[PDB]
Design a protein around this ligand. Structure first.
Ligand SMILES: CCN(c1nc(Nc2ccc3c(c2)S(=O)(=O)NC3)ncc1Cl)c1cccc2[nH]ncc12
Length: 267
């Protein structure tokens, strides 16, 4: 059952845009309470069957997910255009936020990255691969509550496989097996989580700055890794390097990553 357009009220201003169209803030009337939403709306009244299918694929993934650290889907609305209606994370992308708020304490960053690791542990348990895990796709509900978003490239793994075999190619967040063998697993998301961690402790600065993708691949194959960000605890940089374990077999999964962040945050 789809959403009722009559119960959706949108703001005029668009929060963001892309090839797909626009993202606007709106409100959806639930059984009694009104709920603030972020709405992804397709361009040219959903003319392109590619964009249409991709929006429907994303919603299919969101329907199966239920976790406090993953954005919830309210539903799909077929109206003047096709619309994907999500809970609103009011403060927006983690990278943009930290770029605007460089006073945020290391302890607050660990908190947020831990929350991300909890959501990813859930996703790994559920056998989904995110495939675009990065600071720009982490949204803040409050300065102390992060949620994972943008499941546009995500894949539900088959019951008999541990990986998915593959336009958009975010090479700077991709593990060596993704680039060399096109294999995407939860261990690959673990590598991306390492880069996300670096981004967060770098206050939303871009990774591997000034480097082309080919240059990053070459750097990593030499055993070189990005350095420790200014003021980042060594324990957290060490975890980053563990996430960037070249050999996927020996790289930690999210259970081990979340456990390390948990123990550092509380102890
Ligand atoms: C990031 C946009 N986004 C969400 N945006 C927000 N809030 C938000 C707040 C501030 C700003 C933005 C978004 S922005 O980056 O467009 N401009 C500043 N909350 C939840 C979702 Cl899920 C989405 C809404 C609906 C479907 C979606 N698929 N992938 C992402 C996404």
């Amino acid at each position: 059952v789809y959403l009722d357009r009559k119960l959706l009220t949108l703001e005029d201003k668009e929060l963001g845009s892309g090839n797909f169209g626009t993202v606007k803030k709106g409100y959806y009337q639930m059984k009694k309470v009104v709920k603030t939403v972020a709405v992804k709306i397709l361009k040219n009244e959903a003319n392109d069957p590619a964009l249409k299918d991709e929006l429907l694929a994303e919603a299919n993934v969101m329907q199966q997910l239920d976790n406090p650290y993953i954005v919830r889907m309210i539903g799909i609305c077929e109206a003047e255009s096709w619309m994907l209606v999500m809970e609103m994370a009011e403060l927006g992308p983690l990278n943009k936020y930290l770029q605007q708020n460089r006073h945020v304490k290391d302890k607050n960053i660990i908190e947020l990255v831990h929350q991300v690791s909890m959501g990813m542990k859930y996703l790994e348990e559920s056998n989904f691969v995110h495939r675009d895990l990065a600071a720009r796709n982490v949204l803040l509900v409050t300065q102390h509550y992060a949620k994972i978003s943008d499941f546009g490239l995500s894949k539900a793994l088959r019951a008999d496989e541990n990986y998915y075999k593959a336009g958009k190619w975010p090479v700077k967040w991709y593990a060596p097996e993704c680039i060399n063998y096109y294999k995407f697993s939860s261990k690959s998301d673990v590598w991306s989580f390492g880069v996300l961690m670096w981004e967060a402790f770098s206050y939303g600065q871009k990774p591997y700055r000034g480097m082309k993708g080919s240059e990053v691949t070459a750097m990593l194959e030499k055993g070189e890794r990005m350095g420790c960000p200014a003021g980042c605890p060594r324990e957290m940089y060490d975890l980053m390097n563990l996430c960037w374990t070249y050999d996927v077999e020996n790289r930690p999964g999210f259970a081990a990553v979340e456990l390390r962040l948990r123990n550092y945050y509380y102890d």
